[PDB]
Amino acid sequence: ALRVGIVYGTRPEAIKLAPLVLALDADPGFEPVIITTGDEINELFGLRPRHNLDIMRPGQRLSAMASRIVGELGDPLLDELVDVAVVQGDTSTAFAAAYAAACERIPVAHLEAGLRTGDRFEPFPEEINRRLITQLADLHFAPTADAAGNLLAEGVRSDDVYVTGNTVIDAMHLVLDNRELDAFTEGRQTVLLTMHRRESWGIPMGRVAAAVAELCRSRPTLRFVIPLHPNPEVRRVFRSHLSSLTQVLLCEPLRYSEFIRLMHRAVLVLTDSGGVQEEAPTLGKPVLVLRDRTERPEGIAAGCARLVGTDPALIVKEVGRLLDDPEAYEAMRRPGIVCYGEGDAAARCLEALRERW
Amino acid sequence: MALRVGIVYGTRPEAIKLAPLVLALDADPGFEPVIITTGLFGLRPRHNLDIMRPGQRLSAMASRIVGELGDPLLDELVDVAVVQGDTSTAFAAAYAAACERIPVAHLEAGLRTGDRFEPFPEEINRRLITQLADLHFAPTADAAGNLLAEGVRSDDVYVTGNTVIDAMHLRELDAFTEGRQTVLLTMHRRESWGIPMGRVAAAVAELCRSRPTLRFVIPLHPNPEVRRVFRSHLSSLTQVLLCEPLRYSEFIRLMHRAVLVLTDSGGVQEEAPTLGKPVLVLRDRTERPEGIAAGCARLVGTDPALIVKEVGRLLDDPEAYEAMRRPGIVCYGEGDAAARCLEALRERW
Ligand code: NA
Ligand code: NA
């Protein structure tokens, strides 16, 4: 049976790999072997790591992380007799893991391959990681035809590229199968607002807080759920502005299951998160991006996402249009699924693996 | 404050091709070269990391270089890092530089065999370095073309040529070779060991018997199985000197004196034609096909009849000799390449 290495270090990697892992378990042709470089999410999907290297820490030098992964991942890959190594996305784990696999002459498959902003070292190091992984990988699981196109421009052979789609829709269905969050949202149009980036802290958060106030004052039927940042100085702003409004629930940081349950119930999503810009349109949610740029420009091009920055007049206007113009809402909802790839992607990865090996 | 240019290498061939760029960066008042090593020209290393060893795991080498090169690059306030060729140093160094947001320039960029993981890890290294580098010093138009196929912007690619010709210009086997036409024969590859080395040994014997005026110098590999064959066949021949591995200065001096070169070395397939030496390649394939196309090299395998024939033609037909000598020297790129690298650096930064 083909022994398939699954290497990740972070929650977003684990979420996108889980449906491939589960499908590799179920199919008798393959044996998945999970090695981590970075637990809640392991328990939620039923992922049982065989090795936990414990490399990654907060505020560790990129060079230190890469060095430990490049130095230490080979031995467990060899001990577990791994035939192929799968890495995911644009992470420094995925790059360092792929180089480690290539040093032992172990073929690499890449889940979610071919995404390009066309903006060198923006973001850093995600953009260079993508291009390095693309040179190391024998097999490329592209989420869309456009992604596949980008791999060809970088010298990848057509026979190595499969349009597999995106596993994230399958991972979110798996967690779709709570106290007041259900009571607060039921019967109402609810906005999910996640705002967490460091450049968003202080003044911009206040500007977004004022927009929420305005919308709540104009639209009595409208509700907002706003997860508060775990840093007391940061969560101070939203409390000082919004705690007295009955139409606004300020909650503690959410676990993944509660979070995507809430996102599924919401009518639209306001976020500065690259992850949420992908997840929300995949569940059919129009996204306003609380930034003047994005790491996911595909959503802007397809029209399932819209840059709104932290301008309160624009946020009010843009939220209004979507609540009042069912045409406007659909023109963001329709392109949203299929923008980041079709679902049932795990099965398409297995076919490509069964064909090559 | 001059533009501080990091020069990172671990091996002799890197150091050889970088030396003329280093010397030119020294001379020019707009730049300051800073040599960091990972493993005769007047190269002054500022930091020597004794990372590399014989028979060390690639993953161990890459890990130490990726982990340890950043700090010295930052301490020495390096603005740009230059790496050379297809080495694991050049790749690991480039990633280390990129982690500290230091731009990378690549000397001898764009060579592609079109044969994935052959050789390993040189072929993947080339493609990784190409993604990391901001500036590409391609030795030829064809190399530049290969960088575009992998998504490199035309603005970042300069046809600089090849520094190796400039680097090369910088007793008992003297007695043996003086006044005679001397053939240099270097043979090391594993697939060549045993029977094929005997076939090459027999060709040398035949040529020596037919041409009493002809001489051969054959540096012996440190592998006893290689020394055994050559000894059994060639130790009794007066016209054949079997010597120990040569120092680089004596080796290039010998190659300059030689009338032609027989080799299974990719390095020598480049160096010999660059000094105007016709090359017979002791292989059925090559990682330097440009030399075959230009006609300064010829595949001869280990076929004794062909070796005899091919050596004969060149020794007897001075027209045939020139038709292999001329297309060398600028087959692997034009010279004066260091100056072209400086121009490209001064243009971008
Ligand atoms: Na299985
Ligand atoms: Na200088």
Residue numbers in the entry:
A (entry chain A): 2 to 39, 46 to 184, 191 to 370
B (entry chain B): 1 to 39, 51 to 181, 192 to 370
Reproduce passages from the article.
Here we report a structural and functional analysis for an epimerase, KasQ, that primes KSM biosynthesis rather than the previously proposed KasF/H, which instead acts as an acetyltransferase, inactivating KSM. To better understand the catalytic mechanism of KasQ, we solved crystal structures of KasQ for the wild type (WT) and its complexes with UDP or UDP-Glc in resolutions of 2.44 Å, 2.58 Å, and 2.09 Å, respectively. In brief, each monomer consists of two domains (N-terminal and C-terminal domains), in which each subdomain is made of a typical sandwich (αβα) architecture of a Rossmann fold.
In consistence with homodimers in solution, an asymmetric unit contains two monomers colored in rainbow (N-terminal blue, C-terminal red) and gray. Superimposition of these two monomers with an RMSD of 0.86 Å for 317 Cα atoms indicated no significant conformational differences. Two fragments marked in dashed lines (residues 40–45 in the N-terminal domain and residues 184–190 in the C-terminal domain) are missing from the model due to lack of electron density, likely a consequence of structural disorder/flexibility in loop regions. The C-terminal domain is formed by residues 201–359 composed of a central six-strand β-sheet (β8–β13) sandwiched α-helices (α9–α16) on each side. The N-terminal and C-terminal domains are connected by two helices, α7–α8 (residues 173–199). The cleft between these two domains provides the substrate binding pocket. A sodium ion was observed in coordination with the carbonyl backbone of N-terminal residues Leu25, Asp26, Asp28, and Phe31.
